[PDB]
UniProtKB/Swiss-Prot annotation, chains A, B, C, D:
Changing E143Q: Shifts fluorescence to 506 nm. One of its GO terms (biological process) is bioluminescence. Belongs to the GFP family. This is GFP-like fluorescent chromoprotein amFP486. It comes from Anemonia manjano (Sea anemone). Keywords: Chromophore, Luminescence, Photoprotein.
């Protein structure tokens, strides 16, 4: 895909609401699509000012499968989708009753990916790890990719690691949709590593890095 | 509660996104809080103009427990919450993988309830009853109300009725939060009846009526 | 149904396994089918002798919808099923990860119902309310009955009450199957009250009483 | 572990019930614990004689993590558990409402593993892929292993492949328990490949082969 280059840039805008707390997020990043790597910086602004009111890890995976190392031969559902574009829809089902839904659209112009997202979380326990900001990051995961009714689906039982060492389970279910039809891949898996680093005391300024590789299974 | 009168008015504003379709909804209604009844009219405006793109029934229950007939003696968690206000958070888990989260805030001034909500739905099958607008309304339900960690929770296995007569299951889980502490009720049940009537071909203009009664169990 | 009389007797046999603990249960009871009431006594024998190793409340609802007061006119799916017989299948999804599946068969001879069941529970936390025997009984419930693919289904979000006053959620999903076709009822609800009383220190000897009424909704 | 040799034998006995159909299974196999491979042959006998009444794939994963290639250094939770023994508990949550629970115990004598299991399935749609025997086998999976409350847990979103090419989702949740404490492993993943081959028309005689490797993640 001549449209996707070796080095790309990214810009992000998110509108969200978590447990009734409204916020917006702005971000910028750079990545190497073929290498499967990317790093970006974000700034969260709570509607009522103030420090980030919940764990940023619930938002991290919302902030682009084009950044996945695929074997050259294998149909790359994500890279093939550009320049037309793609949309994503993800359900996050947490083990303690919190649930979040997120949907986003990605467009491309030149070397720049514009990512516009909406995030909504509800029912997180007021003293749980999300609202109390007790998480440290996601454990490395293996997301199963399958085709269903013409679109690619991703499923993974993810684990958010906690400050003292324990874990908190979250089932992810995602629909990856292309604007135009592309050659479909066979079922496969995407291995991920994502790291979150707070840049300020409040957690409002944060950096994220993801490494992802696709494996023929 | 002198603040809640025999006849009240309502005004609504919703910002939402379903399967990537953005929309806003405006509405107005009237109700009898002590009788447990209310009727309102809504207008949905799709971001891209055009007929309503999905079943309005997924939004109906988002558009106020003050409209519940409670036995005079029983603590009325909802009526007691005013004038301070209340917030609601609901998870809708559909049997076909669609999930929606909704959160809203209700405030009161005089005889007027202002209801401001956010709705987000994802993963609904493109040919399922929601996206294909094949539903007719919710079957009468019995929502169990229980207290958990200081707030009232509502749980119900709801069924959306379909055009040909079949049913489509949806589990509802809701947190009912008050701005200030109120006397808590014992576990109980709220029986509901809700009717949706389209006023235009597109389904963009719709009327809703709900009847609800609380039963000591 | 001349086959179902005003006063009936019951006999029970259960083979089960919970968290690897094998056990069998024997029981006897009496009830008034038209009144919707019944009381029975059980004896649990653990494969390894010893006191009952888990909360009997997980088994209680397994130990007959013929004991439901139905309005004379309404199709009684359960009473109509005899003398041919019925089979039941129930999934219990607990909020802490424990899950139990149960299936049973009921036959009738004269005034006697023979109930033969199988129960299997797994993944209950070793220190949770089930394994630590911290429950007191089920809160009164409203089970929604719907027809799906030719059989009657029952759905309810049940709550097991705990020793200190809290609650523990369990979603029940049941298929009610008849040996021969019967006239189907419209969707409705069955209201229940079930009480468990230990007769010995170990909880191995226990009495259960259920009251159930069907409501046209 | 001197107790686990390069070549081992296996014998199996299962008592089960699926949608009210009782059956028993007997089996024998051979495997290479360190290589992560094993092959066994089974014979299912339905209580009422007759061909196997449901997809054998729901039982396959019930029929031993000692057969996993682990890097020599990494704590092998499963091999360390012998000679004392281990017990397993697994919840299978199918996307169409069917649910199965299974629990089993494995003991060792000499080169022989004895595996005794109980299987119970309910609520599978009468015309679904399980009851209609429309499955072909499990897609290759990546099971996440995490430690929780002192025992190892396995989680995976598995997919059962169907005769025409489609897929059927099943979430697996398993507790792996040792009879005595062992050194715990860090969170990791087990990659699996399992193949089922019918040896008779009815599917009552079947062979299974599994290859599994643990990856440090």
């Amino acid at each position: 895909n001549k449209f996707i280059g070796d080095d790309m840039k990214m810009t992000y805008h998110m509108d969200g609401c978590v447990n009734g707390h409204y916020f917006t997020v702005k971000g910028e990043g750079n990545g190497k699509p073929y290498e499967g790597t990317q790093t970006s910086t974000f700034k969260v602004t709570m509607a009522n000012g103030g420090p980030l009111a919940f764990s940023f890890d619930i938002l991290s995976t919302v902030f682009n499968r084009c950044f996945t190392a695929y074997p050259t031969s294998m149909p790359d559902y994500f890279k093939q989708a550009f320049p037309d574009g793609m949309s994503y829809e993800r359900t996050f089902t947490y083990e303690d009753g919190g649930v979040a839904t997120a949907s986003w659209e990605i467009s491309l112009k030149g070397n720049c990916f514009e990512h516009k997202s909406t995030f909504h979380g509800v029912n997180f326990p007021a003293d749980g790890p999300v609202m109390a900001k007790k998480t440290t990051g996601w454990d490395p995961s293996f997301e199963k990719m399958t085709v269903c009714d013409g679109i690619l689906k991703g499923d993974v039982t993810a684990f958010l690691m906690l400050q003292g060492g324990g874990n908190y389970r979250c089932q992810f279910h995602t629909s990856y949709k292309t604007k135009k039809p592309v050659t479909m891949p066979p079922n496969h898996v995407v291995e991920h590593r994502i790291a979150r680093t707070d840049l300020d005391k409040g957690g409002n300024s944060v950096q994220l890095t993801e490494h992802a590789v696709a494996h023929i299974t």
